[PDB]
Structure formats: structure tokens, C-alpha cells
């Protein structure tokens, strides 16, 4: 992170009532899933100090709303329908 | 009106060290350091005569100054109340100054918390719930002031003293402990507040994980000069049963509000002894016999069943207790608060898990090695 | 008369809101109504 | 004399824009203006494609 | 006209709320933004004068734009309560003025300060020689009042520039009985 993310998201909060910031990956090297989303949160403490807004891990996943792989699939040129279990196991 | 402080200027010896300056503040016509001069007449020990006269000029501030936040005006009516000693005119005067002095800031919260603070002369439970509740109705947006949250603690703690929720003093004391984290007053008064905090959280029971935030510094730095066994009986409900002299020293020393539900306190030694006995031994024989229960939990054979059905009502442990062998079976529990030595020495489970599930992953893959294919 | 400034601010806000209604209505209506007319002009059926 | 065996260096992102807009546009056809570069003769390159206004066109 | 992107800050901190000259200092800061924005409205229709705040953040509300009337509506309820900072306005103005389109203008700044502002001697001398290294001439203004024998903005004036400098000067303001156009008229000459 940096320090501004919260102030930026709260500035834009006027636009979207639930505005999100996303730590985006510029180098896919992860074990699993890339960039994830973090919506406005009010999670201060049992202490309950002035409400911190460090946006928590607002889970999501890679939604492919439509196929549109007329080209996307046409880009892979690598894989099949893996009838692979061992890959899953080691990973 | 300049002649007003020409005649009310001299207010003691060495008090004209700020009044010879005040006779030029309003010539300079300023109001930042004159708001701070209200705050400094609070700071220097004024016996409420310059403010109790300048209150008509505070009306005049509301008339033709019309820019400064009424922070200092609420301050000055709650500091004229030493001259007044009567709040019933101050309430209508304060809501008058609420509706006639404008600002963009959060003012309804400071006004209703000052009404809560001077509400103690009313004979509570009649107007407290309404406007004390209105305060948190207007707290959700931004509690940036947060001395309004401290006064909100104070009205909420006199509202705790409106009887009815005897461990809401613990959560409300978290609101006190985080109203302002630095405790901004000397140690003695709030360490007697930590004394009665231990008491008022001890004896009442809405909370069930009572031995929890004892590690917090702003209360234990108060406890370090308290009586030397209130710490230890809070440890007898933190550790949980095995300080027999302390889980009995609550019955030896601390007498007021004790004998009503020290039976429930010794119910909680058993509720906490369950999580003790199934946590501190990680090992099996989770179909435990009733014997340690009936020995160390000061309970009988006919009451272990109530000891764990009341815990089914509690809901932190839900054992499938044997009743042909009378064995008190251990299922899932709510474990602890902190074991920092086991936060360090959980390696024998964590790194155990890591390298051993890793090694057996390597072994499964190593036996199915050359079907990599 | 201190409320006169806030009233002028609110009146400028009402003017900007009327201008925004003018935009969202008439400007977008150029497009929308023009497409409706196209369907009407450029080229009869039963409920 | 551009008579050659020519080429186009497409940008898959613009392909995504095209599928995105025509996939669920009006049942009619859509049309717009490119954003690339006449890089050479025997090939060309494309990088960018904007979406088009919805004015009744063809 | 002389080519610059004169940057105006709003003095929307805790010390622009008293009634010492007029019954308000919002009139002083607000009509000063008025006169500078109408000067850059009449001066050249290619400038970029919007707003920047010093109170607790650098909220760029609208675009650093040629027009001014939206910003003159935002000067109404400018909210003068917050933490004044002389260091953040010039820095975010430097990066905002490295976010310019029409490359026709240099970098100029007016920073409305009504407080004994919070900025180290090391901070002012570093800011001022970074504006030596980054070719900026700033017209330094005090509204409201500043504490007598001013240290921060006067030494920013001192070490601000060179090699065609002639921008860095500071008018100190007393909190006397006077008027608000005579508290912008004393800094309208030499910012």
C-alpha cells in the first residue's frame, strides 16, 4: 500500500457509495489469484477509536461475465480440457 | 460594553496579567485567542464571576460576532454554572444557544452531551434514554471530535448507573478506554476507577470472556498501585480457576455486590475450566471423566449436567457428554485470549504442519514421481 | 441577514440543478427523440 | 505501388473492444474510427479503438 | 502578460474566522481569490487556476481550468477549520503544474497563510532550493495574521530562487482595525 489510498477512496466515495481500491498486480508471479478488491470498511477496534478506513479484504474472484473467447480462447494455443490432478496436488 | 470590562477588568492579583491583555483583545477585535481566553479563564482558576457577567456579552457574541463555533459558549455556560448552581435555566439557555449560534460543524452532539453532563440534577431514567440515545443517533457520521465520545462515555456510565446491564460497564469502559487513549488526568482517580472497573465488571455478568483485555496497558499501569489481590482475582478469572485462594479471595475480601451471583462467578470458573481442561491438554481422551470437573470445579455429580447444559446455553463449548460412564466429553471449544509463549512455541504445530504436510506431499508426489508424464 | 448568503448559494444550486435538468432532458432528448423520429420518419402493427 | 503481400499488426485489446460492443449492441451493425499507425507499407499496426456514439448511422 | 500558472491556495484553516477587520476574514481570502481569478480570467484565456487547500489534505476539487465560477461557488463555505500547512500546497502544486496540457505557462504560486504555519527550517530551506532546482517563482502572501518576526515564509522568500528570481517577497499582516480590501490591497501589489 501507500498512505493515500484511504483518502483517495474517500474522495471518490461521493461518486460511488461503496467505492473500491484494488491492489493491482503488474507482474503475474503469484501462487494463486491476482489483484483483489477492498471496499470502505468501519472496523476500528474493541478499543473503537475514530473509525479507521483501511479497506479490508472484500473478497472476489475472476468473473468471466461472458465468454467472448472467440479471440480470447484463440489466444491460448496451449491447453486442452485436462481430463492435471497431480498439478492440482503439487500446487 | 467596553466599559463593561473596564469595570470588570480587575479580577484578582496577577489576573490582570491576562486582563490588561484582554482590554486590548477586543480592541484588536479578535476571537481565536479570545475563544482561547474563555479557555484560559477556564485554565486560570476563576471562581465564576467574569464569565457569569460576560454572559450578556456572550449573547452579544451570538449577536454580532456570528462566526466562531459555539464550543466556547457551551464551555462558558458550563463554567457559569459554578456561579449559577442551577441547571434548569441553563438547559433552555443552552438549547437557545444551540438554535441561535450557527456553524457547519457537528454541534447537536456537543449540545446534547452537555445536556447529558448537566442532566445529573434531573432524577434520571426519564430523559436520559431519549437524548442520550439521540447522541449516538448522531454519532455514526463522523466522531471526529471524540471528546464528545468521552462525554458520551460519561452520560453512558451514569446511564450504566441507571441500573440494568451490569457488564455493559466493560464495553462502555472500552468506550472510556478509547474515548481518548492517553488518559489525560493523573493516575490516582482513574486507578480507583480501575479498582471499581474490576469490581463492576467482575460481579455483574453480561460478558462471558471476562478475563480478556487485562493485558491492556492503560489499565494495568493503574492497577500496579491498586490493592495487590484485585489484580490477582482478575487473574483468577483470566487464568480461570487454579488460584484457589483468589477464586475464594473474591469471597474473602470483596464484599459489596458479591453474594448475589458469586454462584454465577463460580459457574464461570467452571465454564472457563472447561476451556482450560480441553486447551491446556492438547492431547486426546476427549471423553474425559467427570472426576477433574467434580474435584477442581467445586461441583457435584448431580450438577455436572447443569454445568454443561448452562454452557450449551452459553455456546462456547457443546460437548457430547457420556452418561453411561458419566464421562464429560470434550468437543470444540473457544480456546483462550493470549498464550504469547505458545504464540512463539506453536512452531511444534505450525512448522510441524508446514514441513510435515510438505514432506508427505513430496512423498505422495515422490511415489507418483515419474507419471509426471 | 446572514442567511442571505446561504440562500444565494442555494439559489445558485437551484439554478445549476435547473441547468442540469435542462442538459439531461433536452440534450439527451435531442438524441433520444431524434432516434424516435428516425424510427417514425426513416420507415403499423398490432398489440 | 502498395501492391504487396501485406500485413496488419492488430492489438488484441481493440479486438476485445470490438467484441464487447458488437456482442451486445443493437441488432444492427456498428462502425467507428481506428487508432493506430501507418507504420509501414507491407504491414500496418493497430493499438487503440474508442467506442462510438450511438447516433443513428451505419 | 507574463507567462505563469499562478497557483492560489485557500487559507481554509482554523485562523481565518474572526471579526477583526470586517466581521469575517473569509471576505479577505475569498475576494482575494476573486481578484486573482478575474485577473487570470482577463489576462489570458489559456491559464489554469482552480483551487488547492491546505487544511489536512490537498483536495483538488475541480479541474485546474480556465473558467473560475465553479471555484468561486466553492469559495462559499470554504470551511476555515483545519491544519494549515505551507509545505504541501507548493509540492502538490508542483506536481499538478507538472500535470499541465497547454505548455505555455511557467510555475507561480500564491499561498494564503493566516497562521504561524508548521514547517521546519530544514523544510523551508529544502522546499526553497527545490524550487531553485525546479525553476519556480512564488509570490508569498500573509492574510489573517502571522506571528511577529516571521520565520517560515520570509526565509522561503529569502532562499526561494535565483537566475531570474524576482518573485519571492512577503507582506506581513497585523491584526488591527482596518478593512479587507485593504488587507488584499497591501498584498495585491507584491505577493
From Swiss-Prot, chain B:
Domain called PCI: residue spans: 168-335
Keywords noted in UniProt: Acetylation, Proteasome
GO biological process, one term: ubiquitin-dependent protein catabolic process
SUBUNIT field: Component of the 19S proteasome regulatory particle complex. The 26S proteasome consists of a 20S core particle (CP) and two 19S regulatory subunits (RP). The regulatory particle is made of a lid composed of 9 subunits including PSMD13, a base containing 6 ATPases and few additional components.
Source organism (scientific name): Homo sapiens (Human)
Presence of keyword Acetylation: yes
Keyword Acetylation on entry: yes
N6-acetyllysine, modified sites: 295
UniProt record similarity statement: Belongs to the proteasome subunit S11 family.
Pfam families linked to this entry: PCI (PF01399), PSD13_N (PF22037)
Identification of the protein by name: 26S proteasome non-ATPase regulatory subunit 13
Function in brief: Component of the 26S proteasome, a multiprotein complex involved in the ATP-dependent degradation of ubiquitinated proteins. This complex plays a key role in the maintenance of protein homeostasis by removing misfolded or damaged proteins, which could impair cellular functions, and by removing proteins whose functions are no longer required. Therefore, the proteasome participates in numerous cellular processes, including cell cycle progression, apoptosis, or DNA damage repair.
Any one annotated GO CC term: nucleoplasm
UniProtKB/Swiss-Prot annotation, chain C:
Location of this chain's protein in the cell: Cytoplasm; Nucleus
Residue ranges crossing the lipid bilayer per the database entry: none
PTM comment text: Sumoylated by UBE2I in response to MEKK1-mediated stimuli.
Known role: Component of the 26S proteasome, a multiprotein complex involved in the ATP-dependent degradation of ubiquitinated proteins. This complex plays a key role in the maintenance of protein homeostasis by removing misfolded or damaged proteins, which could impair cellular functions, and by removing proteins whose functions are no longer required. Therefore, the proteasome participates in numerous cellular processes, including cell cycle progression, apoptosis, or DNA damage repair.
Disease implication from the record: Deafness, cataract, impaired intellectual development, and polyneuropathy: An autosomal recessive disease characterized by early onset of deafness, cataract, severe developmental delay, and severely impaired intellectual development. Patients later develop polyneuropathy of the lower extremities, associated with depigmentation of the hair in that area.
Family statement drawn from the similarity comment of this UniProt entry: Belongs to the AAA ATPase family.
Protein name: 26S proteasome regulatory subunit 6A
Source organism of this protein record: Homo sapiens
Full-length numbering of the shown residues: 44 to 93 of 439
Curated annotation (Swiss-Prot), chain D:
Domain of life: Eukaryota
Tissue and organ distribution: Widely expressed. Highest levels in heart and skeletal muscle.
Function (record text): Component of the 26S proteasome, a multiprotein complex involved in the ATP-dependent degradation of ubiquitinated proteins. This complex plays a key role in the maintenance of protein homeostasis by removing misfolded or damaged proteins, which could impair cellular functions, and by removing proteins whose functions are no longer required. Therefore, the proteasome participates in numerous cellular processes, including cell cycle progression, apoptosis, or DNA damage repair.
Assembly information from the UniProt record: Component of the 19S proteasome regulatory particle complex. The 26S proteasome consists of a 20S core particle (CP) and two 19S regulatory subunits (RP). The regulatory particle is made of a lid composed of 9 subunits including PSMD4, a base containing 6 ATPases and few additional components. Within the complex, PSMD4 interacts with subunit PSMD7 through their respective MPN domain. Interacts with TXNL1.
Family: Belongs to the peptidase M67A family. PSMD14 subfamily.
Protein's recorded name: 26S proteasome non-ATPase regulatory subunit 14
Taxon lineage: Eukaryota, Metazoa, Chordata, Craniata, Vertebrata
Gene (name only): PSMD14
Span covered, complete protein: 24 to 81 of 310
From Swiss-Prot, chain E:
GO molecular function terms noted in the UniProt entry: identical protein binding; molecular adaptor activity; polyubiquitin modification-dependent protein binding; RNA binding
Ubl conjugation keyword on record: yes
Highest taxon of the lineage: Eukaryota
Repeat among keywords: yes
Cross-link (Glycyl lysine isopeptide (Lys-Gly) (interchain with G-Cter in SUMO2)): 122
Record key words, sorted: Isopeptide bond, Phosphoprotein, Proteasome, Repeat, Ubl conjugation
GO cellular component: cytosol; nucleoplasm; nucleus; proteasome accessory complex; proteasome complex; proteasome regulatory particle, base subcomplex
Domain VWFA: residue ranges: 5-188
GO process annotations (BP): proteasome-mediated ubiquitin-dependent protein catabolic process
Function: Component of the 26S proteasome, a multiprotein complex involved in the ATP-dependent degradation of ubiquitinated proteins. This complex plays a key role in the maintenance of protein homeostasis by removing misfolded or damaged proteins, which could impair cellular functions, and by removing proteins whose functions are no longer required. Therefore, the proteasome participates in numerous cellular processes, including cell cycle progression, apoptosis, or DNA damage repair.
Family: Belongs to the proteasome subunit S5A family.
Domain remarks: The 2 UIM motifs are involved in the binding to a multi-ubiquitin chain in a cooperative way.
Protein name as annotated: 26S proteasome non-ATPase regulatory subunit 4
Organism expressing this protein natively: Homo sapiens (Human)
